[PDB]
Amino acid sequence: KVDDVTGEKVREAFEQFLEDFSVQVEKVYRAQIEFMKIYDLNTIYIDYQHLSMRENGALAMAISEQYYRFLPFLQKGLRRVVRKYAPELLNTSERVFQISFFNLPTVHRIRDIRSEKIGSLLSISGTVTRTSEVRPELYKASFTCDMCRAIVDNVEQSFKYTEPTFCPNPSCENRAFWTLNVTRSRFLDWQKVRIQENANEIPTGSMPRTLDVILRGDSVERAKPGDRCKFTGVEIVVPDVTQLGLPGVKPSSTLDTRGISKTTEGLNSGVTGLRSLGVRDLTYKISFLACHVISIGERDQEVFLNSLSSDEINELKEMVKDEHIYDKLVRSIAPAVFGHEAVKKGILLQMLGGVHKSTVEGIKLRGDINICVVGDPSTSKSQFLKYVVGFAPRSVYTSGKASSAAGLTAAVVRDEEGGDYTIEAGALMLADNGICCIDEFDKMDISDQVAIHEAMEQQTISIAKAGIHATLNARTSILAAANPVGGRYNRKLSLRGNLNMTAPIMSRFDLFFVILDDCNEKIDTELASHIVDLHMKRDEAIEPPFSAEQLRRYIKYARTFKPILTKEARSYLVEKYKELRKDDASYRITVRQLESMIRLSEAIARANCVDEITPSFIAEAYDLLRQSI
């Protein structure tokens, strides 16, 4: 049989690259193969820059230009390397291996795709707009002769169902009538994703171009719709298999539901002559096959302590030790604003959160803190929302009036590509286990105010219309910003008269914060000076005790704790509830206030990294409740 000579040189060069690189002598690729052996992985990663220094690019350019023809030899050399250095990775519980290339020198756009790079190794960038299911693809087929019962195996398939031709025994004469052994055959994961051009590469007036990218193996589901991803792989061409004689009658010679373009009728150049085609004409289209994908656009203490490094672990425990830590944390929140320390403390308590409990009877007790901040304009109420949405994970930002049909809770819309009713997501739904920052909270629609009557307390949304019936989930905290009715706060009317919310909605907010500015000669100078110290030095203007990352780590570490209540804490709690109820006189104070006080005490306890609750914490929570009523 005819063999290749350049392929052999590439095969030995790849083996030498794998065995010899060692540049960090660490044997980085042998380290990777050992890591695969211990972790039972099925894909290897090869960097282009690492290969870009051996043979002065003679191997790298040879691989890049003719990746399609050189891949079989690369895998063959990898098999020998694996056998020589790690036989355990030669068999499964054989592992079909994959090679992933990345860090290519130059990137291409979708509009640079020409037929003269077919078969070459490229990298492309685009925004994903559709993904499909993970279907199984037939890789190594196995059949049995109908008469002999002889078994054939490892029948390669390119683009269509291919059965063998000659029986294993030349004594048998059989051209067809095989039976696939679906159990013995090997399968692989398969996914098709649709991408389009980026917003900047699109010209002033353009209909965006599209492409079909094929993800296979371990690369499935790594690209999600709406994201911006950089793919790398080989540019291939895909024929029309329907006119290549598919076995079944199901294709029925290109059955169609829509009319094809008359403009390209006869203009699309189709080749004829082949015996399999018959008198038909074969057509081609360009698609992409990707091997590597990148994106360019747990409250358990024991497992948490494992991930962090030793320096981080010691720094965290030294941070915990000091007793002033609490006073520091309220200063680290939003270091780009002046004043409003109470707002910072409230935001920190909200981010820390409270414990969620379930009773034996099955009723759920809420553990989310809701905050409402009101005041007259130009009081930096909208800076806190931006800080939270930038710093808090799984947080969303929204306004009172929403343009979307599912404004804040949910909507029912028919399937765009299916025969069922689906459910869209509102801002409340998109914030499960997260903070929702609502701005201009006054101008909400009444059908939404009544709808939020369930999300704030039961943390669910329940709809029942013609199409679908469901009980959705909204376990989200709410940080709301509102303006007084009439334009300006009045310092003799209460919160109720100045605000517009009803007693149902008003009683579901854990904390109310009224922030007021005053026009005096001296404070205005300080505020102006502070706001203008920026815009000359962007970084040295503000200096907090802790950076963003230290605070982000401390919050995650503190949320692992779950405090309990002591014996005297319960007595102090009931005494304070009784005193508050007496002082109210039942119009504004209910059981929900006691539950909120419990939540605030638990959050304050989480702040100090203590697993027991002291009556001082209940006193602090009581003071915080009294300050807002």
Binding site: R135, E137, F159, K160, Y161, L180, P225
Partner: protein, 97 residues
């Protein structure tokens, strides 16, 4: 034959659901009703389809589930515990109690 979509609670917020086909044999027909939420134990199988290979352009296969067991979960939050296919059914000693 029935089609099972993913439950809205299970689906990540804002993503499209997925669906699969389930074959119900004798003694299991008409147990599940259109609109209910169900849990099915079964066998996951594959089969060759000409149209699927023709449209996609690769030798991909179709999948389907042959149902073995059916459990209703419409309105049930006690699924956290309990054992069996129906927690509202009783045994002889339970009736005697």
């Amino acid at each position: 034959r029935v089609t099972l979509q993913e439950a809205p609670g299970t689906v990540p917020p804002g993503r499209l659901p997925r669906h699969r086909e389930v074959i119900l044999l004798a003694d299991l027909v008409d147990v599940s009703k259109p609109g209910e939420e169900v849990e099915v134990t079964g066998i996951y199988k594959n089969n060759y389809d000409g149209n699927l290979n023709a449209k996609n352009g690769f030798p991909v296969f179709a999948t389907i589930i042959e149902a073995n067991s059916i459990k209703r979960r419409e309105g049930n939050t006690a699924n956290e515990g309990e054992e069996g296919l129906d927690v509202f059914s009783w045994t002889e000693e339970e009736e005697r109690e």
